Amino acid sequence: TTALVCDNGSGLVKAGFAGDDAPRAVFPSIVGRPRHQGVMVGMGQKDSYVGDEAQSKRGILTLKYPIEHGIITNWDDMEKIWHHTFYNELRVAPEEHPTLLTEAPLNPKANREKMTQIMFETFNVPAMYVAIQAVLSLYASGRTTGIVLDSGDGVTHNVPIYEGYALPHAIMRLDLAGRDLTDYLMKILTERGYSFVTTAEREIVRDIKEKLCYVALDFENEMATAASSSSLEKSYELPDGQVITIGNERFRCPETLFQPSFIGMESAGIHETTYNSIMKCDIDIRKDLYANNVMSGGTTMYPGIADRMQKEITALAPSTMKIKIIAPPERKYSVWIGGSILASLSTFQQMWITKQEYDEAGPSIVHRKCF
Amino acid sequence: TTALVCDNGSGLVKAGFAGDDAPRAVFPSIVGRPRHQGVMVGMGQKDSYVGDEAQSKRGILTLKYPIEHGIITNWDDMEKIWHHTFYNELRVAPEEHPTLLTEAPLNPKANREKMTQIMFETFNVPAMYVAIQAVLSLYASGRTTGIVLDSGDGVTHNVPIYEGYALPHAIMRLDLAGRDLTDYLMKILTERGYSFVTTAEREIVRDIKEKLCYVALDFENEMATAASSSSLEKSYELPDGQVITIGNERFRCPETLFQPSFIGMESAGIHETTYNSIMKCDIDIRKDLYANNVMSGGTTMYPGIADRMQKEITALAPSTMKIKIIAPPERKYSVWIGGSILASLSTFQQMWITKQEYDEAGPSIVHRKCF
Amino acid sequence: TTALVCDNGSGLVKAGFAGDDAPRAVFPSIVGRPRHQGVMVGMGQKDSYVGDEAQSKRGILTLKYPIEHGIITNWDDMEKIWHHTFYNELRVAPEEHPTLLTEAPLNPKANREKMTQIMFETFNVPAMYVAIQAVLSLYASGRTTGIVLDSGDGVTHNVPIYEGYALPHAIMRLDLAGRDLTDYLMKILTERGYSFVTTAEREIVRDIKEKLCYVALDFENEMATAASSSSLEKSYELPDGQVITIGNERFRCPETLFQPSFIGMESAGIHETTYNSIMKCDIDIRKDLYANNVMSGGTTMYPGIADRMQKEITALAPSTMKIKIIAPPERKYSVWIGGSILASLSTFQQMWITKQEYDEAGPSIVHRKCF
Ligand SMILES: Nc1ncnc2c1ncn2[C@@H]1O[C@H](COP(=O)(O)OP(=O)(O)O)[C@@H](O)[C@H]1O
Ligand SMILES: Nc1ncnc2c1ncn2[C@@H]1O[C@H](COP(=O)(O)OP(=O)(O)O)[C@@H](O)[C@H]1O
Ligand SMILES: Nc1ncnc2c1ncn2[C@@H]1O[C@H](COP(=O)(O)OP(=O)(O)O)[C@@H](O)[C@H]1O
Ligand SMILES: [Mg+2]
Ligand SMILES: [Mg+2]
Ligand SMILES: [Mg+2]
């Protein structure tokens, strides 16, 4: 039976069949419920819309993300989304196909406990597993060593690995990701006048960000150049033809990745986070982590991010050494690609949590058998 | 049993059977009484006349409209109109038939309350319903989405709808319609000495308005042209042989719809009201309302009005949009046709207010079981 | 030289001198112009009227508000109102006095840019300063640690301030204020038949609101009480001579504050906004923010709103905390009184913006020498 690799990301749900090389389907993880009053008798049915249907019709809906910082907060929505992805997207019976999920490190235990409980008692999947995301990212690159910086929609996390051996005492999780960047872009935009408030309008600010934002290579220089002239301005068209124009916002918003004091946070930037992640590990493996940075996750698709991080980390690490910022072209999907790779292995097929094992031991097994 | 549709307008009662595509009865909504002595013997009885039997004898009658501005102001006579419709036009005792009525939006509660009270207590219909006029207008075109502009005889109101979900904060009503324009035409006809002072002469002026008037496409150019030439003047023959000739009145009277300050009202024209109603809707759907602007009501029957709405909304709205005014050729009965379609839904048979329910809860039930 | 303090309200301009106890002059911020034509020579002159004189004659004027939601939309008329204050109400040439102004938070930048440019180029004030309204609101009360819930005529906003160190990432600004409550009241007064359809009658609805609206401590309970008994029905006398009776509108009108979905808005009520603004702050400072909720703004004078806010917030904050609301009688002028306090301090004299500094650096200096 061909396994399934369901990466229940925090912003987008990626899914597909093991043995493939790209997800069968992608779509946002939003459950929309109508907000106004229905007058047309015999029309306006389907009290709730999920996925792309609620994405397009968002004018009359309220968009709820069930995942808030990588931690599933509302469960009824999550069950809804899993049923949707299994049936109306993949179009297969879950009770015959192994599944492989993904989770962030340092998550509350009840999260994955209930994840497995749902998978086994609602969908009756024959087998399932819960892998960490950076390990799959490091498979997707095809490596055994490296330090993985996977920044999704909810969470940012470093996870140094060396020759297959993870070093949990240096894993660092920094809860600052794409969603916060959009919520700060929305707030800065008012300086020009534009007011984006409703839940739906976050999905227009998100597109503005995805379309126009780029991380600076020298923040001070970019501010100076922007102030000098309008060379950096770019105009965007709302869904009402009205055109908006943003200048230095384009690189002020991503800057928050490196100076979380923009959003008020105390944590340090991602460059210092990765550096301090390297320093905590054993001194004799630092050489192969300094030289094997491997990015992942969507948030790392801003132009100029790689050069900026190269410069910023090299301004920290000892000069004689070499820092190499590997950025796979499809890093937006590395976790799922690695999941497919893992589910392909013959050696791995002895590590499944089978329905008999779950029935014998109970939900708590998923902690023992899973990293 | 078969239901009845009774679109009790302010100018014309349109009553018939659900299923047909036309009203079975169409008579004016007036109730006349004699203002002269009755020296004849055994002749001139029936102190009051109703409908066309009143119109044909308007020589010796005083005409009254039981409905004014869409709020019923004389129930003793609206009862006579209902009695006439049921018993002489459709020729059916209502006690057997479900009855479907209509009321304009923002129209006081104590109006439909007393309408329900009358229908249940006096005629004793098995069940009934009060559907808003814009919504039926929207069914008649079979659409799902658009901004409905009804311009009846006494009220002009908009009701934006997207995918079936109405927006109560964008329902803008403008009580300027056919009777205001009839009175204004009577006012400006005095410039040429034509003095129409009574009610019968108001009916004659209403026929003048229907027969001659048309909406200008550029008011200042039309005024200059008419003032500089006789290309526009037209004639009409009164019911005693005298012949009248009118000029720029023809397009001055309709223009009041786009400039109510012609009659002292401060509100905005119909174009501005439509734009404001759309612009109170969510940004997500304005692209779909711009291209689905419906029309209805008798007063929008002027030749070239659709072109003027096109021009005004095109000038007002953002340049990157497709304005398209939907003007069905049969749009004089659009509300009634929509009602006929609505009453013939199997899903709508659960929406009727049944006699037992009103006996239980009372007139206020209409505020619950009806829009 | 006594430095004025000109609080720029959206609905009421509050002006006076620094050091006083309360404003020397108060007058509404509207600019009116007649719509009809003059017929008698030497009468009905001076096409434009401003403020209270426009209020007095509003029967023949069209009334425009230069400010919308706190953002000066009509500069040509705000200039006239500033001229009016300086040269008729206070009756002092401004170029002899430092002039302290105010501005709401999260307010677009070009707004205060031009607000400074006009002040320095038309009136040529020797100095000036543009404070925030929450900081002044907290000055007036003499505290140092509070979260001001300032509800005005254009903007409702919270601002947590602790020991004088603001938290710029927690400030919230909602575009719901007195004017929307007035508009919703004017709409729901059509449920009874009263039609208020002119810019002149917006002020009659405004006074009906100010004089008969009150907030319910338990919305559903008050609705039941109103339906069951007429004890909540009170009558009012319109200037035209008529009389009106209003039942449950009296509290249905201010309820838009706590369930903004009544006016089609999605955002959360004021109590939820305050709770969120307190939950976005550091952990250890919430204890003192809970205990110093300082109210302000005219919209907050609705009887029963302090109690309502305290009752509602105590259901969100953990039971162990001592939620307090401070509702001084003079909370309407709080911002101006705070400005009067600020201008008199001896430590403030250095942070003025002087004519020479503006000349050397232009309007951009406002973002640098203020908050
Ligand atoms: N081309 C892009 N440029 C910038 N940001 C992007 C791009 N694509 C996706 N993102 C960001 O990535 C987030 C969603 O994608 P993703 O990182 O993969 O979430 P997740 O892994 O949890 O499924 C969004 O916050 C979005 O801002
Ligand atoms: N061809 C026409 N041209 C101009 N005005 C018209 C035309 N037909 C009807 N009207 C006007 O519309 C009014 C009646 O239209 P109607 O839709 O039936 O009003 P109601 O809301 O009561 O149903 C009349 O007063 C008449 O003046
Ligand atoms: N006692 C009151 N009760 C209720 N509303 C009031 C009261 N006083 C003023 N208002 C309303 O608040 C607004 C004026 O108050 P204000 O705080 O000064 O607005 P702004 O800050 O913009 O100057 C007006 O819309 C008015 O209707
Ligand atoms: Mg991810
Ligand atoms: Mg009509
Ligand atoms: Mg204020």
Give residue C58's Cα distance to chain centre: 22
Neighbours of chain B (3+ CB pairs under 8 A): A, C
Q: Provide the token pair at A177.
A: 């990701």
Pocket test for ligand 2, best of B5, B7, B10, B12 (most atoms within 8 A of CB): B12
Instruction: Let me know the angle formed at the C-alpha of B367 by B274 and A32, rounded to the nearest 5 degrees.
Output: 60
d(CA A122, CA A83) in angstroms, rounded, equals 9
- The first and second tokens of residue A326, run together, are 């590997």
Greatest C-alpha distance within chain B? 74
Contact A215, A251 (CB under 8 A): yes
Residue found under tokens 């400039």: B259
Give the C-alpha separation, C172 to C274, whole Å.
8
- Distance of CA C103 from the midpoint of ligand 6 (Å): 8
Dihedral Cα A123, A124, A128, A134, nearest 10 deg:
10
> Would the CB of B299 count as within 6 Å of ligand 2?
yes
Give the DSSP letter string of B250-269: HHHHHHGGG-GGGGT--S--
Beta-carbon contacts of residue B188 (< 8 Å; ≥ 6 apart): B249, B252, B253
Rounded-to-integer distance, Cα B62 and Cα B84, Å: 18
Burial B97-129 (b: 16+ CB within 10 A, else e): bbbbbbbbbbbbbebbbebbebbbeebebbbbb
**What is the DSSP code (8-state) at residue C321?**
S
Interface test with C, best of A60, A185, A190 (most C CBs within 10 A): A190
Interface residue of C113, C169, C279, C368 to substitute, partner A, most A CBs within 10 Å: C169
Q: Which residues pair with B20 in a beta bridge?
A: B18
Check if B298 has its Cβ closer than 6 Å to any atom of ligand 2: yes
Superfamily of domain A182-270: ATPase, substrate binding domain, subdomain 4 (3.90.640.10)
β-pairing, B12-17 vs B4-8, is: antiparallel
Q: Which of B269, B155, B108 is nearest to C187 (CA)?
A: B108
A310 touches chain C (CB under 8 A): no
Nearest CA to ligand 3 atom 3: C210
The structure tokens 């609301």 sit at: C325
Residues of A in contact with B161 (CB under 8 A): 39-40
Residue C15: strand pairing partners: C25
- Alpha helices by DSSP H, listed for chain A, are 52-56, 75-84, 109-121, 133-141, 178-189, 199-212, 219-228, 249-255, 270-280, 286-290, 305-314, 334-344, 355-361, 365-369
| Other beta carbons within 10 Å of C265 | 17
Ligand 1 binding pocket includes A152 (Cβ within 6 Å): yes
Chain B nearest CA to C110, separation (Å): 23
- Count of Cβ atoms closer than 10 Å to residue A168 Cβ: 10
- Would you tell me which residues 34-53 of chain C have a C-beta closer than 8 angstroms to some C-beta of chain B? 35
DSSP 3-state of A166: strand
Residue nearest to ligand 2 atom 8, measured at CA: B298
Angstrom distance (rounded) from CA B344 to CA A226: 64
Alpha-carbon span B200 to B207, nearest angstrom: 11
CB contact under 8 A, C169 and A199: no
Sheet holding A99-103, edge to edge: A4-5, A99-103, A130-132
- Among A33, A37, A39, A58, most B C-beta atoms within 10 A, so best to mutate, is A39
CB contact under 8 A, C170 and A35: no
Residue B253 structure tokens: 């009277």
Question: Which two structure tokens, joined as six digits, stand for A163?
Answer: 């020759």
Q: Cα of A153 to ligand 1 centre, how many Å? A: 6
Locate C158 and state its tokens: 């919270």
Read off φ and ψ for residue B62, nearest 5 degrees.
Answer: -115, 115
Residue A178 CB–ligand 1 contact under 6 Å: yes
How far lies A251's CA from each of A310, B58, C251, in Å? 17, 78, 47
In this structure, what token pair is assigned to residue C242? Answer: 């008529």
- CATH of span A135-181+271-333: 3.30.420.40
Instruction: Give φ, ψ of B126 to 5 degrees.
Output: -60, -35
Residue nearest to atom 12 of ligand 1 (CA): A298
Closest ligand by atom to B105 CA: 5
Question: Of A10, A13, A206, A226, which is closest to residue A104 (Cα–Cα)?
Answer: A10
Task: Report the neighbours of A using a cutoff of 3 or more CB pairs below 8 angstroms.
Answer: B, C
Buried/exposed code over C192-221 (b: 16+ C-beta within 10 A; e: otherwise): eebebebbbbbbbbbebbeebbebbeeeee
Closest CA to C15 of C1, C3, C5: C5
| Neighbour-count burial for A326-363, b at 16+ CB within 10 Å, e otherwise | eebeebbbbbbbbbbbbbeeeeeeeebbebeebeeeeb
Q: What fold does the segment set B28-68 form as a domain?
A: Actin; Chain A, domain 2 (2.30.36)
CA torsion through residues A210, A213, A216, A217, sign: positive
Q: What is the DSSP track for C80-122?
A: HHHHHIIIIIS-S-GGGS-EEEEE-SS--HHHHHHHHHHHHHT
B194-229 burial, b if ≥16 CB within 10 A, otherwise e?
bebeebbbbbbbbebbeebbebbeebeebeeebeee
Q: Both tokens of residue C188?
A: 């729901």
Taking an 8 Å cut-off on Cβ atoms, the answer to whether C193 and B108 are in contact is yes
- For chain B, the first-to-last Cα distance in angstroms comes to 24
Q: Determine the residue type at A84.
A: H
Nearest to C62 among B109, B169, B266 (CB): B266
Is C40 buried (19+), middle (13-18) or exposed (0-12) by CB count in 10 A? Answer: exposed
The partner residue sitting opposite A197, judged by closest CB among C169, C170, C267, is C267
A299 lines ligand 1 (CB under 6 A): yes
- Chain A environment of C170 (Cβ under 8 Å): 264
CA B338 to CA C323: how far, in whole Å?
A: 56
Q: Token pair of A335, please?
A: 């976790």
Q: Do you know the residue count of chain A?
A: 371
- According to the entry, how was the structure determined? cryo-EM
Q: Indicate the fold that domain A1-27+69-134+334-367 takes in CATH.
A: Nucleotidyltransferase; domain 5 (3.30.420)
Tell me which residue in B164, B282, B351 faces A38 most closely, judged by beta carbons.
B164
d(CA B32, CA B65): 9
Contact B286 A240 (CB under 8 A): yes
The preferred substitution site among C30, C73, C133, C153 for testing ligand 3, maximizing ligand atoms within 8 Å of CB, is C153
C-beta pairs of B23-28 under 8 Å, 24+ apart in sequence: B23/B333, B23/B336, B24/B89, B24/B90, B25/B85, B25/B89, B25/B90, B27/B51, B27/B52, B27/B84, B27/B85, B27/B89, B28/B52, B28/B54, B28/B55
Q: What 3 state SS string does B196-208 have?
A: CCCCHHHHHHHHH
Measure CB to CB from residue C266 to each of A35, A193, A195 and give the nearest one: A35
Within a 10 A sphere around the Cβ of C369, how many other Cβ atoms? 15
The answer to whether the Cβ–Cβ distance between C264 and B167 falls below 8 Å is: yes
Ordered by start, the domain boundaries in chain C are 1-27+69-134+334-367, 28-68, 135-181+271-333, 182-270
Bridge partner residues of A151 (DSSP): A156
What's the CA gap between A343 and A335, in Å, rounded?
12
The whole-angstrom distance between B263's CA and the closest CA on chain A is 35
Tell how strand C146-151 and strand C156-162 pair up: antiparallel
Break sites following residues in chain C (C–N > 2.5 A): none
Closest to B55 measured CA to CA, from B240, B203, B206, B178: B203
Amino acid (one-letter) located at B109: K
3-state secondary structure A243-270: EEEECCHHHHHHHCCCCCCCCCCCCCCH
Q: Which of residues 191-210 of A touch B (CB under 8 A)?
A: 198, 200-201, 204
- In order of A134, B148, C8, C186, the CA distances from C191 in angstroms are 61, 22, 35, 10
The answer to whether domain C1-27+69-134+334-367 and domain C135-181+271-333 are alike in fold is yes
**The pairing of beta strand B12-17 with beta strand A127-128:** unpaired
Cβ–Cβ below 8 Å for B266 and C195: no
The DSSP annotation for C54-82 comes to HHHTGGGEEEE-SEETTEE--HHHHHHHH
What is the distance in A from the centroid of ligand 5 to the CA of A160?
72
Q: Which two tokens stand for residue C151?
A: 């509800």
Cβ of B266 within 8 Å of Cβ of C192? The answer is no
Residues comprising chain B, all counted: 371
Residues with Cβ within 8 Å of residue C243, at least 6 apart in sequence: C235, C236, C237
Q: Which residues of B40-62 are buried (b: 16+ CB within 10 A; e: fewer)?
A: eeeeeeeeebbbeebbeebeebe
Sign of CA dihedral C128, C134, C135, C138: positive
Which residue's alpha carbon is at the smallest distance from atom 16 of ligand 1?
A298
C264 and B170 within 8 Å at the Cβ level: the answer is yes
Q: What is the DSSP letter of C2?
A: P
Phi, psi (rounded to 5 degrees) for A73: -95, -45
Ligand 3 atom with the smallest distance to the CA of C7 is 23
In DSSP notation, A322-337 reads ---EE--TTGGGHHHH
The amino acid that residue B219 corresponds to is F
- In terms of CA atoms, which chain C residue is nearest residue A198? C266
Residue with tokens 């112009």: C33
Contact by Cβ (8 Å): B54, B63: yes
